[PDB]
C-alpha cells in the first residue's frame, strides 16, 4: 500500500505534451478561481493539480489587487489534472504557502498561513489536522510550492524561514502519517534553499531549489530518507537555470558555491540528472519570465565548464509569459518517469491592462519515443477580457 | 462499523487553521447559496460542511430580505469541507432547524420545518425518512444547529420547545438507525437550554448550550447514553462565554445556576474540559458578535471566581464580524481531537449597504504542536458587491 519508488528511472530523450488547463481563456466567460503558484502531484491512479487561490474568481470585484502573496484568504485548491478551477473546486486548507504528498495511502498537505513574523504550518493527513509547527526564525515561513516525496511512509518537506538578505534557517521535516517524527537542520554548501523541486532518487530524495542571494545556479539538497542526513551543493552545469542570469556566452557555475552572478532574484525551477548529464528547464529570456525551454547539458551534473546543449525543446515561445515551473515523478510499469509543469502568469505587475494577476498551467512528461516541435502559450487576450 | 469514540482525548495546547470557504467573496461573481447557521461533521473518512440555505443564491432577486429564520424554503445543504455552496450542492431535507450525525454506517439528519406554532421534526437515516415528531409545547421547535453524537449506534439529539425568553421544555431523543427509541425530559439545574454544542465525552455526551433567559454563562448537559440519565449544570468558569455578557473585570458564574448578568439574549458557542481547566471560545466583544477568541481558563470547569486565562488565540479580529460557533470531534489515530467552526455573518440587521444576509465559515482544529498568530476574517467588501 505504501509507495517506495523502488523502480529505476525511465529513459528520457525529451518531453511530450501532457496537459493544459486554459484557465485564463475560460475565465473571460465563466467563473474561474484566481490562482497562482500551482503544481501537480499524482496518487497511484491519476494526477491532480493544486494551486493557491486568492479567495475570489476572476470576473469579480475582489479580483483587483491580487498581486500580493500573503493574505488571510488564500487557500489550497485541488482538482484532477485537467479540470479547470471552477466554483466546484475543493479548497483543502488555509494556506499562502503549500506542499503536497501522496504516500500510497492518503494525501498529505503542508499549509502555511498566518502573520508574516509569527506563522503556522499545519500538517493535514487523510482529512485530519495531525500536526502543527510555528516559525522558528520569526520570519516568513515558506515551503516548496510543489510536491513533496514519501518513501515507505516517511514523507519529506523542505521549509525555509528567514530573510534572503540575512540568515535563513532551512529545515527538512520527516513526517509519518501527518505526524512530524524528525527535523534536520540544513547542512552543506548551499547557503539559500527556497522553493525546492524534489523528486525520489531512490534511496533518497533529491531537490533542486532556487538561490535568491549571490546565485544564478540552482542549489541541490540530497536527503537520505533513512539516516536523515542532508547534503548540499549546487547544480554543476555551466548553463545556469535561474533568472535573472547571465548570457550563456558569459556564464558559469561552481558546483559547490554560488557563482555570484546576477544572483539577486531567482525563479522557481527544476533539474534532474541522467547519469552525468543534466536535464533542465529555464525561461528563454535571461532577465524576465518570458518563454520556457528545456534541454540536456552533457556532463552537466559533474562538470562545471560544460556547455554542450542537446535535445532542446521550446515549451513556451520566447515572447510569451511563463513563471514558476516544477517537477513531479510518475511511477510507470517498469521505471519512474519525470514530468514538469510550467506556470504561465498573466496580469498586473507586467501587463497593466488588467487589475488582476492569475496563472494557467502547462504539463509535459518525459518520453522514450520521438517528439516534434510546438509552442503552447496561455493564449488569453487581455485587451478584450472583461473589465 | 459502528463508531464508539472509545479513545482518549487528544492533548490540546491550542488550535490550528483547518479550513475556510470564502463564500461571500466568491458570491460577488458566481452562484453561491444564501446560507446561515452552518456546522461541520465528519464521517470516518473526511469532513462535511452543512448549512441552512434560504432557497436562493446571493445575486438573485430572492436574496432580498433574507434575515428571517423560518421560511418554507430553507433547506439543509451538505458539501464536503472546503467546497463552497455552489449550485451543485445537494440539499438533503426541508428544514429551518437542523442537526446531523454519522454513526459509522450512515448519515442521520434531524430536520425541523412547518408552521412556528405546529412544527414537524423529520428523522432521516441512510436516505430514508425513518421517523417524525410533532411539537410538544406548540411553539418554535428547534434543535442544536450543530452535529449530534452517536455511540454504539445510539445517537442523541437535544431539542427545545417553548418560550424564547421563559421556561421552555427540552428533551433528549435517543435514535437508533433513524428510529426514536427513547425520549428523556431534561432534568437538573439548567433552566434555559438552546443550540447545544455536543461532543462525545466517552462514555457519554457532553453538551454546552446557550442560556437565552437569565444567564451569561453556558449550560452543561451530561447525557449518559447507556442509562438515558440527564444531568444539568452551568459552565463554572468566571470568564463567561455568552454574548451579551458583562466586563471580564465584573463577570460571575454560579457553577449551578444562571448568573443573572446580561442574560437577555445570547449566541451559540462551545466549550469543553481538559482535566479541571476549560477550553472555550467567545466573541472578543461583549455586546456585539464582533471578533472571536479562544483560550483556556485554569480550573475553570470546577471553580468559579477563576479568571486565569492561558493559550489565548485570536481567530477573528476584534473589528470583524463573527456569529454562531460550535464544536465537532474527529477520531484520530490514538485519541479524539476537538475542532471548532466559526460562522462569519455578513449583511442586513447591521451592515445596511446590502439587502441580504449570508455567512462564511472558518474551521480550526486542536493541536499538540505549536502555532502562531493570525486573523482570518470573511474579507468580503460589501461596498462593491451587488445589493
Amino acid at each position: 500500500e505504501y509507495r517506495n519508488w523502488s523502480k529505476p528511472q525511465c529513459g528520457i530523450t525529451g518531453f511530450a505534451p501532457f496537459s493544459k488547463d486554459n484557465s485564463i481563456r475560460l475565465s473571460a466567460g465563466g467563473d474561474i478561481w484566481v490562482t497562482r503558484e500551482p503544481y501537480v502531484s499524482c496518487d497511484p491512479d491519476k494526477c491532480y493539480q493544486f494551486a493557491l487561490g486568492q479567495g475570489t474568481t476572476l470576473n469579480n470585484v475582489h479580483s483587483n489587487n491580487t498581486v500580493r502573496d500573503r493574505t488571510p484568504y488564500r487557500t489550497l485548491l485541488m482538482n484532477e489534472l485537467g479540470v479547470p478551477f471552477h466554483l466546484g473546486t475543493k479548497q483543502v486548507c488555509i494556506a499562502w504557502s503549500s506542499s503536497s504528498c501522496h504516500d500510497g495511502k492518503a494525501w498529505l498537505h503542508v499549509c502555511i498561513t498566518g502573520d508574516d513574523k509569527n506563522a503556522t504550518a499545519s500538517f493535514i493527513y487523510n482529512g485530519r489536522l495531525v500536526d502543527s509547527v510555528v516559525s522558528w526564525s520569526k520570519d516568513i515561513l515558506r515551503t516548496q510550492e510543489s510536491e513533496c516525496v514519501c518513501i515507505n511512509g516517511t514523507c519529506t518537506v523542505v521549509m525555509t524561514d528567514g530573510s534572503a538578505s540575512g540568515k535563513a534557517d532551512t529545515k527538512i521535516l520527516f513526517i509519518e502519517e501527518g505526524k512530524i517524527v524528525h527535523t534536520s537542520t540544513l547542512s552543506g554548501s548551499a547557503q539559500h534553499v527556497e522553493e525546492c523541486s524534489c523528486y525520489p532518487r531512490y534511496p533518497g530524495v533529491r531537490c533542486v531549489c532556487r538561490d535568491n542571494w549571490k546565485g544564478s545556479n540552482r542549489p541541490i539538497v540530497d536527503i537520505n530518507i533513512k539516516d536523515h542526513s542532508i547534503v548540499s551543493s549546487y547544480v554543476c552545469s555551466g548553463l545556469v537555470g535561474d533568472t535573472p542570469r547571465k548570457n550563456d556566452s558569459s556564464s558559469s557555475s561552481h558546483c559547490l558555491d554560488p557563482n555570484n552572478e546576477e544572483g539577486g532574484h531567482g525563479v522557481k525551477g527544476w533539474a534532474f540528472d541522467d547519469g552525468n548529464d543534466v536535464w533542465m528547464g529555464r525561461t528563454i529570456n535571461e532577465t524576465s519570465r518570458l518563454g520556457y525551454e528545456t534541454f540536456k547539458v552533457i556532463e552537466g551534473w559533474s562538470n562545471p565548464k560544460s556547455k554542450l546543449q542537446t535535445n532542446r525543446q521550446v515549451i513556451v515561445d520566447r515572447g510569451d509569459r511563463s513563471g514558476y515551473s516544477g517537477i513531479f515523478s510518475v511511477e510507470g510499469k517498469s521505471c519512474i518517469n519525470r514530468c514538469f509543469y510550467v506556470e504561465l502568469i498573466r496580469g498586473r505587475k507586467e501587463e497593466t491592462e488588467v487589475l488582476w494577476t492569475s496563472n494557467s498551467i502547462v504539463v509535459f512528461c518525459g518520453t522514450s519515443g520521438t517528439y516534434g516541435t510546438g509552442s503552447w502559450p496561455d493564449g488569453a487576450d487581455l485587451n478584450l477580457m472583461p473589465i | 462499523e459502528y463508531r464508539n469514540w472509545s479513545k482518549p482525548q487528544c492533548g490540546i495546547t491550542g488550535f490550528a487553521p483547518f479550513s475556510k470557504d470564502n463564500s461571500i467573496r466568491l458570491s460577488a461573481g458566481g452562484d453561491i447559496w444564501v446560507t446561515r447557521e452552518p456546522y461541520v461533521s465528519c464521517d470516518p473518512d473526511k469532513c462535511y460542511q452543512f448549512a441552512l440555505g434560504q432557497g436562493t443564491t446571493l445575486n438573485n432577486v430572492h436574496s432580498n430580505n433574507t434575515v428571517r429564520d423560518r421560511t418554507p424554503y430553507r433547506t439543509l445543504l451538505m458539501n464536503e469541507l472546503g467546497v463552497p455552496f455552489h449550485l451543485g450542492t445537494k440539499q438533503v431535507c426541508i428544514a429551518w432547524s437542523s442537526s446531523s450525525c454519522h454513526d459509522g454506517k450512515a448519515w442521520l439528519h434531524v430536520c425541523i420545518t412547518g408552521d412556528d406554532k405546529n412544527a414537524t421534526a423529520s428523522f432521516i437515516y441512510n436516505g430514508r425518512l425513518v421517523d417524525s415528531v410533532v411539537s410538544w409545547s406548540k411553539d418554535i421547535l428547534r434543535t442544536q444547529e450543530s452535529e449530534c453524537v452517536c455511540i454504539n449506534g445510539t445517537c442523541t439529539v437535544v431539542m427545545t420547545d417553548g418560550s424564547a425568553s421563559g421556561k421552555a421544555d427540552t428533551k433528549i431523543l435517543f435514535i437508533e438507525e433513524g428510529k426514536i427509541v427513547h425520549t428523556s425530559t431534561l432534568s437538573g439545574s439548567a433552566q434555559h437550554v438552546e443550540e447545544c454544542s455536543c461532543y462525545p465525552r466517552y462514555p457519554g455526551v457532553r453538551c454546552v448550550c446557550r442560556d437565552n433567559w437569565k444567564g451569561s454563562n453556558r449550560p452543561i448537559v451530561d447525557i449518559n447514553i447507556k442509562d438515558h440519565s440527564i444531568v444539568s449544570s452551568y459552565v463554572c468558569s468566571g470568564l463567561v462565554g455568552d454574548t451579551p455578557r458583562k466586563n471580564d473585570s465584573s463577570s460571575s458564574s454560579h457553577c449551578l445556576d444562571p448568573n443573572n448578568e446580561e442574560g437577555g439574549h445570547g449566541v451559540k458557542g462551545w466549550a469543553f474540559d481538559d482535566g479541571n481547566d476549560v477550553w472555550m471560545g467567545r466573541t472578543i466583544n461583549e455586546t456585539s458578535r464582533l471578533g472571536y477568541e479562544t483560550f483556556k481558563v485554569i480550573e475553570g470547569w470546577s471553580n468559579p471566581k477563576s479568571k486565569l486565562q492561558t493559550n489565548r488565540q485570536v481567530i477573528v479580529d476584534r473589528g470583524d464580524r463573527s456569529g454562531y460557533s460550535g464544536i465537532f470531534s474527529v477520531e484520530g489515530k490514538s485519541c479524539i481531537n476537538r475542532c471548532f467552526y466559526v460562522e462569519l455573518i455578513r449583511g442586513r440587521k447591521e451592515e445596511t449597504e446590502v439587502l441580504w444576509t449570508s455567512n462564511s465559515i472558518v474551521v480550526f482544529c486542536g493541536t499538540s504542536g505549536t502555532y502562531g498568530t493570525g486573523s482570518w476574517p470573511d474579507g468580503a467588501d460589501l461596498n462593491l458587491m451587488p445589493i
Partner: antibody
Amino acid sequence: EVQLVESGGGLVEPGGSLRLSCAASGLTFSTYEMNWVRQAPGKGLEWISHISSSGFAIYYADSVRGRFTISRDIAKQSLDLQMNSLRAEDTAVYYCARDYYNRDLGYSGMDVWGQGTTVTVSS
Amino acid sequence: EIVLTQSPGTLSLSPGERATLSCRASQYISSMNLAWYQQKPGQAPRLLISAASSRATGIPDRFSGSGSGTDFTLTISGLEPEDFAVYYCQKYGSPYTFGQGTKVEIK
C-alpha cells in the same frame, strides 16, 4: 482623494513631547507594514521607525531610538508615534508610509505615503 | 551601515533625453530589497521602481531601473517637464536607508 492621513504635529519647546497620528481607510493598518520616515528641511529622507503587520515587532533608527515610540490603537484602524524628550534636531516633515515584502518579488516599496506633517521644535 | 551613494551629484542635463542615475552600495546587497522614488519638492516621495527592475503601477514604461551586486542604475528614456525632481534609492532591512539625493535639472 482619501488614503493614509497623518496629523498632530505642532510647535513645542525642545525637551517636550508630542503625539503624531496617521489614520487610513482601505490602505489599512491590518494588511501592510507601516513606517515613519522624516525629512529635515532640505535634507535627505531619513527612515526612523518600522512597525510590522501585527504591530508586534518594532524597529527604530539610531537617531530617535529611546525617545520615540511608534504604536497602533484599534481606534479607526490607526497608528501613532509618541515622541518624548524632543530636541532641535527633530524639526522635519514627518511621513507615515506602507510597505509589503513579497516572498517571490521582494520589496513592494512604500507605494502610499501620507501628505506630511510639519514639526518645528523651537523656543 | 550599508551606505547607498547615489553617484551622479546631479545629471545636470538638457530636456528630452536619457537620464542615467546611479546608486552604489557599501557591501553586496541583494537587488530584491532596493527601490527608487521620485520626490518632487513639496510633495510626498512617489515610488518609481521596486526590486531594482520592477516598475510601479501608474508609472509609464519609460522608467527602467536595473543593476546588481553593489551597483544599480536608473535610466529614463525621455525627460519631460515633470521628470525634473529628486530621486532616491532605498533599501529594505534593519535599518532602512535612503540615498543622499540625486537631482535632475533643466538645460
